Amino acid sequence: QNMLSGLYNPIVFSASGANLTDAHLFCLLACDRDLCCDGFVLTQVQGGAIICGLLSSPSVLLCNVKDWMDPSEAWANATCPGVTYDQESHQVILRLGDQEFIKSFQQVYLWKDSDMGSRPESMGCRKDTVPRPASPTEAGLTTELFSPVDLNQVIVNGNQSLSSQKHWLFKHLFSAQQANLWCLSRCVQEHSFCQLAEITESASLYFTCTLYPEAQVCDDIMESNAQGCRLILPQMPKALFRKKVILEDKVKNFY
Amino acid sequence: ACLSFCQLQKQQILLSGYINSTDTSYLPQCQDSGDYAPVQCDVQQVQCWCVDAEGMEVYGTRQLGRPKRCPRSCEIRNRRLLHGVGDKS
Ligand SMILES: *[C@@H]1O[C@H](CO)[C@@H](O)[C@H](O)[C@H]1NC(C)=O
Ligand SMILES: *[C@@H]1O[C@H](CO)[C@@H](O)[C@H](O)[C@H]1NC(C)=O
Ligand SMILES: *[C@@H]1O[C@H](CO)[C@@H](O)[C@H](O)[C@H]1NC(C)=O
Numbered sequence A: 001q002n003m004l005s006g007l008y009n010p011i012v013f014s015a016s017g018a019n020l021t022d023a024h025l026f027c028l029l030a031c032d033r034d035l036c037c038d039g040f041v042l043t044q045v046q047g048g049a050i051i052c053g054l055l056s057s058p059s060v061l062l063c064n065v066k067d068w069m070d071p072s073e074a075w076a077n078a079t080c081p082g083v084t085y086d087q088e089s090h091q092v093i094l095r096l097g098d099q100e101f102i103k104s105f106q107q108v109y110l111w112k113d114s115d116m117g118s119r120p121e122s123m124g125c126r127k128d129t130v131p132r133p134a135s136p137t138e139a140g141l142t143t144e145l146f147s148p149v150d151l152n153q154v155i156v157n158g159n160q161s162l163s164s165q166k167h168w169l170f171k172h173l174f175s176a177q178q179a180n181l182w183c184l185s186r187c188v189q190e191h192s193f194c195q196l197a198e199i200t201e202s203a204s205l206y207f208t209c210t211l212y213p214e215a216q217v218c219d220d221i222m223e224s225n226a227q228g229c230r231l232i233l234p235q236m237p238k239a240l241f242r243k244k245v246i247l248e249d250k251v252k253n254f255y
Numbered sequence B: 001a002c003l004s005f006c007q008l009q010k011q012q013i014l015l016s017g018y019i020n021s022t023d024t025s026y027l028p029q030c031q032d033s034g035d036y037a038p039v040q041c042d043v044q045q046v047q048c049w050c051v052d053a054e055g056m057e058v059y060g061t062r063q064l065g066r067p068k069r070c071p072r073s074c075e076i077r078n079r080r081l082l083h084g085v086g087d088k089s
């Protein structure tokens, strides 16, 4: 339901006797004749106001329907759903942004896979400009805030319910080193939800930043070393990183 | 009759929110005896913590609304010892 980068032709309209089905039939047929769309987005905000904005080479795709979205926050740091629910008795007015950052049933939804590939300034509409070269006195210092994991410890289940935020990271912008560096810096921005950040490659277009809590279950036996227990993830990633624990003095509980 | 250390502070905060007219979201809730009640918070009652009987806030017991029990003068001194401010006994 969000892209953070890349939005072409926001055909803003509504249904007044028609329905949102034909809106899906509208902007799907718009992506059968050019190269300058790879997916599109389909919104709704309390009825009526719908968007078919088209996607041309996004950087990421963030904030799944199947993640953890209750830090008890709205309208201020609510960059994850994208909507800002205001209460100046506002209640009617539609407003649109540049990353479907809507200022207002909520059915926001997105599509993918034109199997893209282009040429520099040939069939050229959206280029990944200002790629933000991060300073190694800042980018090279966050990589020692974390720690790699030997992948023999993690076992797979695919069956234990584990809440997690997910991301796409398409390969045309992000390199192999920048795939980690965005995902590891994203783990710092969630100060208490992220303990495991992984990067996997299940198909040949993207990367995948999946943020986890501490998925280290342990059995009932009371032994000293932690060798008797391990990690559980739904799939075996290519890389895995722990936000290593930063314990601070002046304890915040009276046990 | 003169005024207890609670009701000295409860007037001093409240007229400072009246002379300067800038509100402070804390006022004490001492009992009839004059000394502080152990649980202390503001009018909205969202973070009620345990306090020392002298007045300083006991560091650590900032719960989200209601302490079931408050630590007394031994268990505070017995635990701050175990953190290590001198006198290992
Ligand atoms: C849209 O759906 C409603 C029922 O929700 C129906 O009454 C109406 O005829 C539909 N309109 C079209 C154009 O399909
Ligand atoms: C978002 O959270 C940060 C960290 O707590 C805070 O500094 C900032 O003020 C918040 N945003 C808004 C609009 O309040
Ligand atoms: C998940 O576990 C259930 C038992 O709780 C089992 O019936 C099911 O086959 C399992 N599914 C997979 C994909 O392992």
Ligand SMILES: *[C@@H]1O[C@H](CO)[C@@H](O)[C@H](O)[C@H]1NC(C)=O
Pocket (backbone or CB within 6 Å): B016, B019, B020
């Ligand atoms: C606020 O009110 C107090 C009342 O005693 C006064 O002394 C002080 O000058 C006022 N202004 C400031 C800036 O504190």
